[PDB]
Amino acid sequence: KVQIINKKLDLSNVQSKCGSKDNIKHVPGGGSVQIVYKPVDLSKVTSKCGSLGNIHHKPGGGQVEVKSEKLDFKDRVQSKIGSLDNITHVPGGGNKKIETHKLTFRE
Amino acid sequence: KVQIINKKLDLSNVQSKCGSKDNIKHVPGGGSVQIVYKPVDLSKVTSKCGSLGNIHHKPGGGQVEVKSEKLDFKDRVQSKIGSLDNITHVPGGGNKKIETHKLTFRE
Amino acid sequence: KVQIINKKLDLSNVQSKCGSKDNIKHVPGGGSVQIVYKPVDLSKVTSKCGSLGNIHHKPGGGQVEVKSEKLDFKDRVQSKIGSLDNITHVPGGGNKKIETHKLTFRE
Amino acid sequence: KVQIINKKLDLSNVQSKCGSKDNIKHVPGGGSVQIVYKPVDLSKVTSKCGSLGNIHHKPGGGQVEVKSEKLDFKDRVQSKIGSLDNITHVPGGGNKKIETHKLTFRE
Amino acid sequence: KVQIINKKLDLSNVQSKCGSKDNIKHVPGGGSVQIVYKPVDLSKVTSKCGSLGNIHHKPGGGQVEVKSEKLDFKDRVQSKIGSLDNITHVPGGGNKKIETHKLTFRE
Amino acid sequence: KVQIINKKLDLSNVQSKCGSKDNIKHVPGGGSVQIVYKPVDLSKVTSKCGSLGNIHHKPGGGQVEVKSEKLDFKDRVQSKIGSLDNITHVPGGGNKKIETHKLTFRE
């Protein structure tokens, strides 16, 4: 008769704040490789075959190739660094995060 | 008759704050490789075959190849570093995180 | 008759704050390899075969290859480091995390 | 009374065929020095000083300086030689060198 | 009365065929020094001082300096030689060297 | 009365065929020094001092300096030699060297 359903996710697939805010840096003297393979995927595959069929679910993924067949440095590779990324991060306090769930029955 | 269902995730698949906020750095003198293989995947595969069928669920993944067939450094690879990443992080206090779950029955 | 279900996860698959906030660094003199294989995966596979079928659930994973067939350093690989990552982290106190679960029956 | 003086050198200073006919060769791959210091000198110094004098006989000689403050070869110094100086020397015979000294007295 | 003087050198200083016909060769791969210090000198010094004098007979000689303050070969110094100096020397015979000294007295 | 003087050198200083016909060779792979210090000198010094004088007979000689303050070979010094100096020397015979000294007295 009476159905009260407070609910947030029923049949769901959630990625939240997921793979973010990351400082990648690369300061080489020379001849160097940095690879940051960072996908954020969300799949939902439902492949119902019937009675004689053929489902070939083959989506394929990332390929990263780096080749360097010849490479020479015939003198001084030099790199002087005073500093990187002089960051000052001063946030102010006094913030409020309020989540209220009121569920009241009466007669 | 009376059904009160306070609930947050029923049939769910959640990634939250998941694989984030990471400082990757790379300061080589030279001839160096950094690989950070960092995917954040979420799959939900439901492959119902029928009675004679063939399901070939083959999505494939990441490939990272780095080849370097010849590489020479015929003099001084030198790297002087004073500092990296001079970070000051001063947040203010006095914050509030309030989660209230009120569920009241009456007659 | 009366069903009160306070509940947070029913049939769920949760990753939270899961694989994050990690400072990776790499300061080589030269000729060096760093690999941080850090995926955060969440799968949910339900493969119901029928009566003669063939399910081949083969998603494949990460491959990281690094080859270096020849590599020479014919002089001084030198690296002087004063400091890395001079971090000051001063958060203020006086914060509140309040989780209230009130469940009251009356007549 | 009778003076017969057959003679060839009385007060003499002779150099003959003296420092000649010499094949100097130099086939370097690179960065090489050949010095052939080959003077042929003939001096005759007669310095008669008198009673308070000063004779400073200082003629000075050869100076050969070769300086090379910096020198680099940053790749393959290669030199393939099939042959040098293919010389055929066929003189014919039947030559005559006749030196006759006849000194005859009669009355 | 009768003086017959057959003679060839009275007060003499002779160098003959003296320091000649010499094949000097130099085939380096690289970075090499050959010095052939080959003077042929003939001096005759007669320094008669008188009664208070000063004779300073200081003619000086050869100086050969070779300096190489820095020198680098950063790859293959290679030298393949098939042959040097393929010489064929075929002189014909039947030559004559005749030196006749006839000194005859009669009355 | 009668003086017959057959004679060849009275007060003489002779160098003959003296320091000649010498094959010097130098085939280095690299970084090598050959020095052939080969002077052929002939002096005749007659320094007659008188009664208070000073004779300083100081002619000086050869100096050969070779300096190499730094020298590097950062790869293969290689030298393949098939042959050097393929010499064939075929002189013909039947030569004559005749030295005749006839000294005859009669009345």
DSSP character at residue D1: -
Residue of B nearest to E74 (CA): B74
State the number of CA atoms in the 13 A half-sphere of D17 facing the CB.
14
DSSP string covering B43-82: --EE----TT-EEEE-----EEEE--S--EE-S-EEEEES
Cα D26 to chain centroid, rounded: 20
Q: How many CB atoms lie within 10 A of CB A6?
A: 15
The SS3 call for residue F58 is: coil
Q: CA dist D80 to D83, E84, E87, F72, F84, Å?
A: 9, 12, 20, 22, 14
DSSP character at residue A51: T
Q: Virtual CA dihedral for D17, D19, D20, D25, nearest 10 degrees?
A: 170
Give the resolution in Å: 3.0
Nearest to D36 by CA among F61, F24, B23, C49: F24
CA triplet A38, A44, A45: central angle to 5 degrees? 115
DSSP character at residue E51: T
Write down which chains contact chain E via at least 3 CB pairs under 8 A: B, D, F
Chain E nearest CA to B68, separation (Å): 19
DSSP character at residue C8: S
Cα B93 from Cα A93, distance rounded (Å): 5
Cα B2 to chain centroid, rounded: 42
Return the exposure string of E30-55: e unless at least 16 CB atoms fall within 10 Å of the residue's CB, then b.
Answer: bbbbbbbbbbbbbbbbebbbbeebbb
Contact between residue B24 and residue A25 where contact means Cβ atoms under 8 Å apart: yes
The SS3 call for residue A36 is: strand
Cα D101 from Cα D82, distance rounded (Å): 53
Chain D nearest CA to A84, separation (Å): 34
**Which two tokens mark C6?**
């306070």
Report the residue from D60, D87, D88 with minimal CB separation from E60: D60
Cα A17 from Cα A40, distance rounded (Å): 11
Contact between residue C2 and residue C106 where contact means Cβ atoms under 8 Å apart: no
Cα B62 from Cα A63, distance rounded (Å): 6
Amino acid at C54: N
Nearest to F63 by CA among E31, E67, D67, D64: D64
Amino acid at B9: L
Amino acid at F53: G
Nearest to E66 by CA among A34, D42, F34, C15: F34
Contact between residue F49 and residue D48 where contact means Cβ atoms under 8 Å apart: no
The coordinates were experimentally obtained by cryo-EM
Cα A18 to chain centroid, rounded: 5
CB neighbour list of residue F44: distance below 8 Å, 6 or more residues apart: E13, E43, E44, E45, F13
Report the residue from D17, D30, D43 with minimal CB separation from E43: D43
State the number of CA atoms in the 13 A half-sphere of D60 facing the CB.
2
Cα F26 from Cα F81, distance rounded (Å): 12
State the number of CA atoms in the 13 A half-sphere of E17 facing the CB.
7
CA triplet F5, F7, F10: central angle to 5 degrees? 110
Nearest to F16 by CA among E42, E93, E99: E42
Q: Determine whether B99 is exposed, middle or buried from the number of CB atoms within 10 Å of its CB (0-12, 13-18, 19+).
A: middle
CA triplet D67, D71, D77: central angle to 5 degrees? 125
CA triplet E85, E89, E90: central angle to 5 degrees? 160
Interface residue D56 vs chain A (CB under 8 A): no
Chain B nearest CA to E73, separation (Å): 10
